[PDB]
Design an enzyme around this catalytic site. Structure first.
Site, PDB file in Angstrom:
ATOM      1  N   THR A  72       8.913  97.125  19.624  1.00 63.89           N
ATOM      2  CA  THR A  72       9.649  96.807  18.408  1.00 63.89           C
ATOM      3  C   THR A  72      10.023  98.051  17.616  1.00 63.89           C
ATOM      4  O   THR A  72      10.852  97.962  16.703  1.00 63.89           O
ATOM      5  CB  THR A  72       8.823  95.873  17.521  1.00 63.89           C
ATOM      6  OG1 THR A  72       7.598  96.523  17.159  1.00 63.89           O
ATOM      7  CG2 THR A  72       8.502  94.584  18.256  1.00 63.89           C
ATOM      8  N   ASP A  79      27.464 102.574  42.924  1.00 68.63           N
ATOM      9  CA  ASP A  79      27.544 103.949  42.444  1.00 68.63           C
ATOM     10  C   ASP A  79      27.835 104.919  43.587  1.00 68.63           C
ATOM     11  O   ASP A  79      28.689 104.646  44.437  1.00 68.63           O
ATOM     12  CB  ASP A  79      26.237 104.316  41.738  1.00 68.63           C
ATOM     13  CG  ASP A  79      26.409 105.415  40.711  1.00 68.63           C
ATOM     14  OD1 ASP A  79      25.559 105.502  39.803  1.00 68.63           O
ATOM     15  OD2 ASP A  79      27.378 106.194  40.816  1.00 68.63           O
ATOM     16  N   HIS A 106      23.616 110.700  41.021  1.00 65.54           N
ATOM     17  CA  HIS A 106      23.863 109.751  39.939  1.00 65.54           C
ATOM     18  C   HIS A 106      23.407 108.349  40.324  1.00 65.54           C
ATOM     19  O   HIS A 106      22.728 107.668  39.546  1.00 65.54           O
ATOM     20  CB  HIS A 106      25.351 109.767  39.582  1.00 65.54           C
ATOM     21  CG  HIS A 106      25.711 108.914  38.406  1.00 65.54           C
ATOM     22  ND1 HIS A 106      25.645 107.538  38.429  1.00 65.54           N
ATOM     23  CD2 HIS A 106      26.149 109.249  37.170  1.00 65.54           C
ATOM     24  CE1 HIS A 106      26.026 107.061  37.257  1.00 65.54           C
ATOM     25  NE2 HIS A 106      26.336 108.079  36.475  1.00 65.54           N
ATOM     26  N   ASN A 113      31.389 107.065  28.115  1.00 63.21           N
ATOM     27  CA  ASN A 113      30.842 108.247  27.459  1.00 63.21           C
ATOM     28  C   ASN A 113      31.927 109.043  26.740  1.00 63.21           C
ATOM     29  O   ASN A 113      31.937 110.275  26.767  1.00 63.21           O
ATOM     30  CB  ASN A 113      30.117 109.130  28.470  1.00 63.21           C
ATOM     31  CG  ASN A 113      29.040 108.382  29.222  1.00 63.21           C
ATOM     32  OD1 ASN A 113      28.368 107.512  28.667  1.00 63.21           O
ATOM     33  ND2 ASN A 113      28.876 108.708  30.496  1.00 63.21           N
ATOM     34  N   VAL A 146      31.329  90.302  31.234  1.00 62.92           N
ATOM     35  CA  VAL A 146      30.205  91.072  31.729  1.00 62.92           C
ATOM     36  C   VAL A 146      29.452  91.683  30.550  1.00 62.92           C
ATOM     37  O   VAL A 146      29.893  91.625  29.406  1.00 62.92           O
ATOM     38  CB  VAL A 146      30.654  92.161  32.729  1.00 62.92           C
ATOM     39  CG1 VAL A 146      31.598  91.570  33.763  1.00 62.92           C
ATOM     40  CG2 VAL A 146      31.313  93.317  31.994  1.00 62.92           C
ATOM     41  N   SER A 148      25.938 105.509  31.520  1.00 67.51           N
ATOM     42  CA  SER A 148      25.568 105.284  32.909  1.00 67.51           C
ATOM     43  C   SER A 148      24.060 105.211  33.093  1.00 67.51           C
ATOM     44  O   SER A 148      23.595 104.685  34.109  1.00 67.51           O
ATOM     45  CB  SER A 148      26.144 106.401  33.780  1.00 67.51           C
ATOM     46  OG  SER A 148      27.398 106.038  34.332  1.00 67.51           O
TER      47      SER A 148
END
Length: 279
Positions: free
Chosen positions: A16, A39, A69, A161, A177, A224
Site C-alpha cells: 500500500t 518482444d 529487452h 516512452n 487492451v 516496456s
C-alpha cells in the site's frame, strides 16, 4: 509467500506504500497460467526461468534474444527472483529483431499467432500477452491488439516512452487492451512515461532489475518494463480465480492503489498495480 530483498517493483505491487523491499504473494504464483512475451525473444536457458520459458515463434533467422529487452520483460513476468508470477509459463514470440525494431506487419502477425497459439497450450488459469513494444498510431496494429484481447487473452501493452499523450501510439491507444504507464520507486510518474485517457494502469517502470541475455541481469527503465508487472499481475490474479482475461485490466484498476502517484497529468488515471495480497 514472502521474497525478501526483492526488486522495488515487485515489493511495490504488493504494498500500500512505497519504500518497502519485500514481495508478498499467494504461493500459487500464477501456476497454470500462461504469459506470451511478444518482444525480441527470451533467453529460455536462463536459470531464472527454471525451464518455464520457451520460444514458440520467431519471424527472423533466429528465435534467440540477441537484444535482452525480451529476456528482461519475461523475467519481470515470471522469473523466480524478478518475476511477478513466479510459477507461470512464459512463451516467447520474437516479433522484434535484435536491434529491438520490427515492422508493424510482423508485429501484427505475432499478435494473431498468440490468438491462435493459445489453443495449443495448456493454460487452465488463462492466457496473458505482454507487449512491451510500440510505435506511431496504426489502426491495423490497434485492431490486431483488439483481436488478441477479444480471443480470450489478457493484453497488456506499454503506454510509450515519449512523455506525450498515448493516443498517438499503437497498440497503446487501443481501448480494449490494458495500456500500462510507468512509475518510479518514489511513486512519481516516470519522466518518460506516456499518459492520457487511454492509460489504464501504472506499474513500476524506472530502474527495474530483471533478467538479461548471457545469463545475467541488469536494471533498465521504460513503460516496456512496467507492462510485464501488470502482465504478470494479471496471470497471478487469474490463477487465483479473482478475474478473467476479459475483466483483468478492469479488475486490476478496481483493486489498484488510488491517488498515490505524483505528476500524473489531469485526465490520466492515478492507479498503481497492486496484488491486494494479505499475508
Amino acid at each position: 509467500a514472502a521474497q525478501t530483498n526483492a526488486p522495488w517493483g515487485l515489493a511495490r505491487i504488493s504494498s500500500t506504500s512505497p519504500g518497502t523491499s519485500t514481495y508478498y504473494y499467494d504461493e500459487s504464483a500464477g501456476q497454470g497460467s500462461c504469459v506470451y512475451v511478444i518482444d525480441t525473444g527470451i533467453e529460455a536457458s536462463h536459470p531464472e526461468f527454471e525451464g518455464r520459458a520457451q520460444m514458440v515463434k520467431t519471424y527472423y533467422y533466429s528465435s534467440r534474444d540477441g537484444n535482452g529487452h525480451g529476456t528482461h520483460c519475461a523475467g519481470t513476468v515470471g522469473s523466480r527472483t524478478y518475476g511477478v508470477a513466479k510459477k507461470t509459463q512464459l512463451f516467447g514470440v520474437k516479433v522484434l529483431d535484435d536491434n529491438g525494431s520490427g515492422q508493424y506487419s510482423t508485429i501484427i502477425a505475432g499478435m494473431d499467432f498468440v490468438a491462435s497459439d493459445k489453443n495449443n497450450r495448456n493454460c487452465p488459469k488463462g492466457v496473458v500477452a505482454s507487449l512491451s513494444l510500440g510505435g506511431g498510431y496504426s489502426s491495423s496494429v490497434n485492431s490486431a491488439a483488439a483481436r488478441l484481447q477479444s480471443s480470450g487473452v489478457m493484453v497488456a501493452v506499454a503506454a510509450g516512452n515519449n512523455n506525450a499523450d498515448a493516443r498517438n501510439y499503437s497498440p497503446a491507444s487501443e481501448p480494449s487492451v490494458c495500456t500500462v504507464g510507468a512509475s518510479d520507486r518514489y511513486d512519481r510518474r516516470s519522466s518518460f512515461s506516456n499518459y492520457g485517457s487511454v492509460l489504464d494502469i501504472f506499474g513500476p517502470g524506472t530502474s527495474i532489475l530483471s533478467t538479461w541475455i548471457g545469463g545475467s541481469t541488469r536494471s533498465i527503465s521504460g513503460t516496456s518494463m512496467a507492462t510485464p508487472h501488470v502482465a504478470g499481475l494479471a496471470a497471478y490474479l487469474m490463477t487465483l480465480g479473482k478475474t478473467t482475461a476479459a475483466s483483468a485490466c478492469r479488475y486490476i484498476a478496481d483493486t489498484a492503489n488510488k491517488g498515490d502517484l505524483s505528476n500524473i497529468p489531469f485526465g490520466t488515471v492515478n492507479l498503481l498495480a497492486y496484488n491486494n495480497y494479505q499475508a
